[model samples]
Target: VLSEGEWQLVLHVWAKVEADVAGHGQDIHIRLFKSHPETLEKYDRFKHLKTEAEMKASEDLKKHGVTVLTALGAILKKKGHHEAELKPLAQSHATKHKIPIKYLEFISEAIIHVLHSRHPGDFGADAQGAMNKALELFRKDIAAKYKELGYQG
Candidate 1:
């Protein structure tokens, strides 16, 4: 149940679903509901499953999901461009869930390894890398920025 403020924000997010962000009608029904322990959306291009799993254990994932949607709202405000920042964002999400570096590395490796086994393609090494190169570069820049700020930026 959403309070007035939450409902307004959710409504604003709903209003941002235009044709471009809708992927030319790739999605028909997008609902807000809780999934049971067995079912979570399996992301193909965006595989941040382990971070999400870590989040659920600590009750951090739900908040992180809200944060991500809030950030997307910002993007939608900018011009309906929703950028997917996979690795570093997932790392931050995992950190929020109190996951350690070694385990986070394991999560990253597990994702790439799954991509390897599930597909005959490069281990996310082709065009996806090319596309994410800018994201990765900015991620490095953000790391430095956060270091100077004495906090995660």
Candidate 2:
């Protein structure tokens, strides 16, 4: 879903912010959980204490955040050709984790929040739309994988 121009925008903006991936990742999850505590309440294995205050300083939380950021980094740096790696993560979540697909949208929305919050000047409307589009493409890619594996969301 990314044109070359859009890809460049994503890559360039990501480069500026990725150095703080750990912090950003944690912030992303915090935004998600803070906005929708139900994800923490009900079904996610990732939630430890449920309070954003308690787990806000969590190393495990940061690590998981880093995991997702690095995954995005890999795909971004590789110019979105890293689906071989992404496919496994997709199917793993579909079959093993068994979470609803909407969580991904939550994550995407959280990411946008993080980006625009941190880099208001850098993440203008154009950049915001590009990032959102890229993230939407990711959701579609993973959802398609889930469908192919016969795993219903």
Candidate 3:
């Protein structure tokens, strides 16, 4: 379970304003479908119209992970650590699940960009410069927050 401060930190990283806008405490739910044989028997009326993008985006509700945001984690996980992972899965996942491949491509590239930025030494000098610039912007944004929390040089 995340403390209030930890949840707030997550929202800051993701730019999620849902709970802030709702004027009430957030409701969070998680369910592991494994070994739940009777779960599907309890069907809901709205299941038929769900699409892949909708399902993927809805993952935001449980806040299980930043599947799209964790580039560094993905590299370490080695489950296809780059855009190449998505290229193959994109069509099939989209076709079977009714997701839009367009957005998936964007997400793939975004992950690559983030990972490249995080590991500047691994990329060429030109790429490293871009990463440095991105890091600068990221640092600038978080600097004030760190200061507010009494983080000093």
Candidate 4:
């Protein structure tokens, strides 16, 4: 559970970047695939995207990026208690999509990078610390379901 101040700080940065969910989401994912090229291959939809320019121009990739961040948007706005929102997302990604759980971590890093780079003065270590706790709790929620569903990856 986050302290009230922590939650507010998170929403602060969230609101800052969320205005362009499509753009920031694309930035986050692009940083992700840049740092972890292997994770890029896991996405069947845009796996063939071979360059940064191509990824930037990809509508499907942009849509998926918005999809990813919006899912986080739901969880963050509810302060991590959105258990109903968690069900199918965790199940499908783990079982059906066969997504490696570590890839979640990869994107987690990517998300932090996006926030920090975009608003360094505001989202510095303190906000970073709070956001880290927030993401940890959220990831912990997903991990519990991952264990129950047996994510054979």
Candidate 2 wrongly placed segments (more than 4 Å): 42-45
lDDT of 4 by residue, 1-153 (tens): 899999999999999878889999889989999999999888788899999999999999999988988888888888877798888899898888877768888889999998888889889889999999999888888888888887644
Error of 1 at 71 (Å): 2.4
What's the lDDT for all of these models?
0.35, 0.81, 0.32, 0.88
Give Cα distance to truth, residue 74, candidate 2, Å.
Answer: 1.2
Every model's TM-score: 0.28, 0.91, 0.25, 0.95
Question: Across residues 80-109, which tens digit of lDDT does each residue of candidate 1 receive?
Answer: 122343335444544443333333233323
The clash count of every prediction, one per candidate, is 0, 0, 0, 0
What's model 2's overall lDDT?
0.81
Tell me the lDDT of model 3 at 22.
Answer: 21
Indicate which candidate wins on TM-score.
4
Comparing candidate 2 with candidate 3, which one achieves the higher lDDT?
2
TM-score of 4: 0.95
Higher TM-score: candidate 2 or 4?
A: 4
Question: Which pairs clash (backbone N, Cα, C closer than 3 Å) in model 2?
Answer: none
Which pairs of residues clash in candidate 3, taking residues 3 or more apart in a chain or in different chains? none
- The 10 consecutive residues of candidate 3 with the worst lDDT sum are 23-32
Model 4 residue pairs with clashes: none
Top of the candidates by lDDT: 4
